[PDB]
Design a protein around this ligand. Structure first.
Ligand code: C8E
Ligand code: C8E
Ligand code: C8E
Ligand code: C8E
Ligand code: C8E
Ligand code: ZN
Length: 706
């Protein structure tokens, strides 16, 4: 048969949808952003060997959506690229990269791509021969990676299946070229282990089943100076701190009139290796039967509880505690067709209790994110109408968000007394309404043309609302904005796809217009003495809002002169611009007049550089499958406020695989050679733009299906 996406109960399908095989992924880098890097329109936001996030059409974090088998990952990778994404592509069956109204099934504000990682955790069928699974192993030079992985499915009778799976990865600091005196990049080592046990029913009509997962990651933080260890931010008026007084314990309640616009900044005045120790424990239940009750063709439910935490450490000492407890429930049903129009409607409840707190030195109370509770009540659905060779699908999502914070009312009344009226203290409630509409014309099949559009509202996160702390790994001190508005977006894309024996291609053109776009506004610049002297110095930011305009293009094209050979060209390009920046109050004059200074439109931070790809593939024969990949990464000269130019490199990759069969199972050998040119690889779209990536690496690996 053929690859079919699972993310939607109702199968929608644009021509830019892309399904990556798990078989392909067993030979790919472990972290999601690395694994996906190289797919047209996808770059990486790497942060050492420990983490990389996908950057899709210039977007990342809360403007895309990573899914662990239809479920919330529960991690804190939206917070900073510092933090690894809790999915395992090396243990995956499939990674589906989807565009269109399907995104509305899972979130509001996803404008670039839904990335769903599907797993074997809960079997869904029964294994041939009663047992099935695979075993995997690979080594990588200058990495120095050792990766072992395995999984098993066993029938406990006629309609019961147990699944186990696990992976361990060990890697040291990666080698780097010409980053002198240094053979390897310090603090870039990364170790990870995962395990899962599942147990499920069998159908028809479908399945019910549960699974438990457990993951430990331990990895260094590269380029981590301690110089800001003994530093705090002054951002609120001293006077305001003396009078409001609640801003000493709860500084997230500040308003614009509390910000010191004269001389805000850092006042300065744990000798161990920087690293992150992260633990994620997961309990879930999946279910899907094929004729629930009359009028509906399918029913799919999903329950999840996820315990996430991570310590940011120096030696054996913890500097920062990160915590995120997640519970998520979703019910989707697909109605029986009414009249060549089909539909899936669903409801979702999502609760996230999170904090990001410093170790109690204390050094004064400035919580990056105080303990907060966010609840998402979401109603959503998609409907597709079919006029034969033309499909038209619409999507909607209405989610109400309640952000609550547990105050000590208690101390606040007493500490404040009089004279001052206390702020709202109420729960922050907002409601997003989003719609999508998409048209697919299969004219002259197999020839697909999609036109997709959406108007989406993204609810501000508690990080964006209530941050008031220092996060060294991103070189920023984050201040939230308690009354942000919803990010509004108007999104348009046209995709064209062809596959015809000799030629294959996929082309896409997109534009994303915001819409009260939320962005980090640097304040500690061009003001008092605490303002920055250098571009590299730490930024004191407060979240603000403006217009934004992203547009770009991406594509691939392959030609097969012979069933043996395939030649290809790939490419992508993306522009991101901040428009309509708000005017900010400047220095107070000698007459006491503080003027609003206007800031021009400027470039978006860490937008990927253009990239061209050249590709060769050839089976020779039946078993051996050689391949060559030459990427031309161009320099990035469209720079945001404090960014520097990024080169600009030549990525040459060689590969080969040996397919060989026997009793029980299949033997997939592979040999890979990365960065043969040993070039200085820099990713403008990462927080470490000027730190080189892996110099040059040899990989040998085996996978054994059975
Ligand atoms: C199922 C466990 C068996 C795994 C052993 C793999 C065989 C070789 O691996 C040795 C692992 O450790 C070796 C130490 O170095 C790791 C990477 O090697 C670089 C040394 O040149
Ligand atoms: C068949 C080869 C598989 C070898 C990979 C090792 C898999 C072992 O890991 C699974 C067990 O891991 C449980 C989760 O990790 C432990 C985290 O908590 C304890 C601290 O390590
Ligand atoms: C629409 C892609 C296939 C092209 C064949 C023409 C389809 C005939 O109907 C055109 C209406 O299609 C609606 C497409 O969805 C709206 C996209 O733009 C929304 C902007 O408001
Ligand atoms: C709601 C289903 C139909 C989706 C189309 C809604 C409108 C989205 O427009 C798509 C085209 O994008 C640009 C539209 O421009 C009009 C307003 O744009 C400026 C917004 O800042
Ligand atoms: C199928 C291949 C056709 C390309 C599809 C669109 C991909 C875009 O590729 C264009 C890459 O162009 C290189 C851009 O050059 C550097 C960018 O900076 C120039 C601005 O001064
Ligand atoms: Zn962090």
């Amino acid at each position: 048969s053929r690859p079919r996406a699972t993310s939607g109960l109702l199968h929608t399908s644009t021509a830019s949808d892309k399904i990556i095989s798990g078989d392909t992924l067993r030979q790919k880098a472990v972290n999601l952003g690395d694994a996906l890097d190289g797919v047209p329109g996808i770059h990486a936001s790497q942060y050492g060997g420990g983490a990389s996030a996908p950057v899709i059409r210039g977007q990342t974090g809360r403007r895309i959506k990573v899914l662990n088998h239809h479920g919330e990952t529960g991690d804190m990778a939206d917070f900073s690229p510092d933090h690894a994404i809790m999915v395992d592509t090396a243990l995956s069956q499939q990674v589906e990269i989807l565009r269109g109204p399907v995104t509305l099934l899972y979130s509001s504000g996803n404008v670039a791509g839904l990335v769903d990682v599907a797993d074997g955790k809960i079997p869904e069928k029964m294994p041939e021969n009663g047992v099935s699974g695979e075993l995997g192993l690979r080594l990588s030079s200058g990495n120095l990676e050792k990766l072992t992985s395995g999984g098993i499915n066993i029938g406990l009778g006629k309609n019961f299946v147990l699944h186990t799976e696990g992976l361990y990865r060990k890697s040291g600091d990666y080698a780097v070229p010409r980053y002198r005196n240094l053979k390897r990049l310090p603090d870039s080592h990364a170790d990870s282990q995962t395990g899962s046990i599942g147990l499920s029913w069998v159908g028809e009509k479908g399945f019910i089943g549960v699974a438990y997962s457990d993951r430990r990651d331990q990895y260094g933080l590269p380029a981590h100076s301690h110089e800001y260890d003994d530093c705090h931010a002054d951002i609120i008026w001293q006077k305001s701190l003396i009078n409001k007084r609640y801003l000493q314990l709860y500084p997230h309640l500040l308003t614009e009139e509390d910000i010191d616009y004269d001389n805000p900044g850092l006042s300065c005045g744990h000798s161990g290796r920087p690293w992150i120790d992260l633990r994620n424990k997961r309990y879930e239940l999946r279910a899907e039967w094929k004729q629930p009750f009359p009028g509906f063709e399918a029913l799919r439910v999903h329950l999840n509880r996820n315990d996430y935490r991570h310590d940011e450490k120096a030696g054996d000492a913890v500097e920062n505690f990160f915590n995120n407890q997640t519970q998520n429930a979703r019910i989707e049903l697909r109605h029986q067709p009414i009249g060549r129009l089909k539909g899936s409607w669903g409801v979702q409840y999502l609760q996230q209790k999170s904090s990001a707190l410093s170790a109690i030195s204390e050094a004064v109370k400035q919580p990056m994110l105080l303990d907060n509770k966010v609840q998402h009540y979401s109603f959503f659905g998609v409907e597709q109408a079919n006029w034969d060779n033309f499909t038209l699908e619409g999507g909607v999502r209405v989610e109400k968000q309640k952000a609550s914070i547990q105050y000590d009312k208690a101390l606040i009344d007493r500490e404040n007394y009089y004279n001052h009226p206390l702020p709202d203290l109420g729960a922050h409630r907002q409601t997003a309404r989003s719609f999508a509409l998409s048209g697919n014309w299969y004219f002259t099949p197999q020839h697909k043309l999609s036109l997709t559009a959406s108007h989406q509202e993204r609810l501000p996160s508690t990080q964006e609302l209530y941050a008031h702390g220092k996060h060294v790994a991103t070189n920023t001190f984050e201040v939230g904005n308690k009354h942000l508005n919803k990010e509004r977006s108007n999104n348009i894309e046209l995709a064209l796809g062809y596959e015809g024996d000799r030629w294959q291609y996929n082309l896409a053109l997109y534009r994303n217009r915001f819409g009260n776009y939320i962005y980090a506004q640097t304040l500690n610049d061009g003001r008092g003495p605490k303002s920055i002297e250098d571009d590299s110095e730490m930024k004191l930011v407060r979240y603000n809002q403006s217009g934004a305009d992203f547009y770009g293009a991406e594509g691939e094209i392959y030609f097969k002169p012979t069933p043996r050979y395939r030649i290809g060209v790939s490419g992508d390009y993306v522009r991101g611009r901040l428009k309509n920046l708000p005017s900010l109050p400047g220095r107070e004059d000698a007459y006491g007049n503080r003027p609003f200074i206007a800031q021009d439109d400027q470039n978006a931070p860490r937008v990927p550089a253009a990239r061209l790809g050249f590709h060769l593939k050839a089976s020779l024969t039946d078993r051996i499958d050689a391949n060559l990949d030459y990427y031309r990464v161009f320099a990035q000269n469209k720079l945001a406020r404090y960014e520097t130019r990024t080169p600009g490199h030549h990525m040459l990759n060689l590969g080969a695989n040996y397919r060989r069969n026997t009793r029980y199972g299949e033997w997939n050998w592979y040999v890979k050679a990365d960065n043969l040119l040993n070039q200085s690889v820099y990713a403008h779209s990462s927080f470490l733009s000027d730190t080189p990536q892996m110099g040059r690496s040899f990989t040998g690996g085996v996978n054994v299906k059975f």
